[PDB]
């Protein structure tokens, strides 16, 4: 039962989480200029809303 080293795989879990998160984050880099502008305006909305919430 132990010959596959289960604790090693349990500690390898954060590596696969990092791989999955990086692959998900790379979807935002689609190369489209209009999406880059839209993401800038989304970030503007988020920053402004956060500043008004914690004012």
Partner 1 sequence: MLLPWLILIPFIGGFLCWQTERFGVKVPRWIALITMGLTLALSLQLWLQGGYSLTQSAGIPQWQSEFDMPWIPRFGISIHLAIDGLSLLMVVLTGLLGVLAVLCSWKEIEKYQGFFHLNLMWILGGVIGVFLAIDMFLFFFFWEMMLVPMYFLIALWGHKASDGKTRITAATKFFIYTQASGLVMLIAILALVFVHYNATGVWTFNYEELLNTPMSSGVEYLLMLGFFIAFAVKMPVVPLHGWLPDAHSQAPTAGSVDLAGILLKTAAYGLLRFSLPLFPNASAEFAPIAMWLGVIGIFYGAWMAFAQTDIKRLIAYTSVSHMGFVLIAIYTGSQLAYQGAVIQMIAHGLSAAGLFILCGQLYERIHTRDMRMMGGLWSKMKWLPALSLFFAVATLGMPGTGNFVGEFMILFGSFQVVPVITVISTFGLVFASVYSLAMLHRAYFGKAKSQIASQELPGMSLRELFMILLLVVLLVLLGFYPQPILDTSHSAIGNIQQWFVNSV
Partner 2 sequence: MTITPQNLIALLPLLIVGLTVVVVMLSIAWRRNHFLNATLSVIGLNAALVSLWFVGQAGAMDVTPLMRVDGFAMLYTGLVLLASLATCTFAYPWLEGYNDNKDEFYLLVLIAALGGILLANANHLASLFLGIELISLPLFGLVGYAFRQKRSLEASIKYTILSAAASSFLLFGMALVYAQSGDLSFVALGKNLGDGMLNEPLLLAGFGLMIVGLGFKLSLVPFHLWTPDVYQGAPAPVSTFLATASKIAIFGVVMRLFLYAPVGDSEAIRVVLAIIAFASIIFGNLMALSQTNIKRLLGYSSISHLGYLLVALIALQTGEMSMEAVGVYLAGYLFSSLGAFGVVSLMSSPYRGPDADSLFSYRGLFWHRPILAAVMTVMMLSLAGIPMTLGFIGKFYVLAVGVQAHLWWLVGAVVVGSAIGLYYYLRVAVSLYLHAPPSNWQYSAGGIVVLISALLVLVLGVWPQPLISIVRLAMPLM
Partner 3 sequence: MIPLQHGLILAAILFVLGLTGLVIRRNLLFMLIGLEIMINASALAFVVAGSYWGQTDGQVMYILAISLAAAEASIGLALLLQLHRRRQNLNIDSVSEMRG
Ligand X SMILES: CCCCCCCCCCCCCCCCCC(=O)OC[C@H](COP(=O)(O)OCCN)OC(=O)CCCCCCCCCCCCCCCCC
3's contact among ligand X, partner 3, partner 1, none, with CB below 5 to 8 A by partner kind, is partner 1
Instruction: Please list every residue from 1 through 55 that binds partner 3, using CB under 8 A.
Output: 26, 29-34, 37-38, 41
Q: Which of 21, 32, 28, 31 is closest to 43 using CA atoms?
A: 28
Q: In the complex, which residues of this chain contact partner 2 (CB under 8 A)?
A: 18-19, 21-23, 25-26, 28-29, 31, 33, 35-37, 39-40, 42-44, 46-48, 50-52, 54-55
Residue in 24, 15, 40 with CA at minimum distance from that of residue 48: 40
Distance CA 47, CA 25 (A): 20
């Amino acid at each position: 039962l132990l010959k596959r080293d289960p604790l090693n795989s349990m500690m390898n879990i954060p590596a696969v989480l990092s791989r999955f998160a990086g692959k998900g984050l790379l979807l935002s880099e689609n190369g489209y200029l209009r999406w880059y502008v839209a993401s800038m305006s989304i970030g503007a909305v988020v920053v402004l809303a956060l500043l008004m919430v914690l004012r």
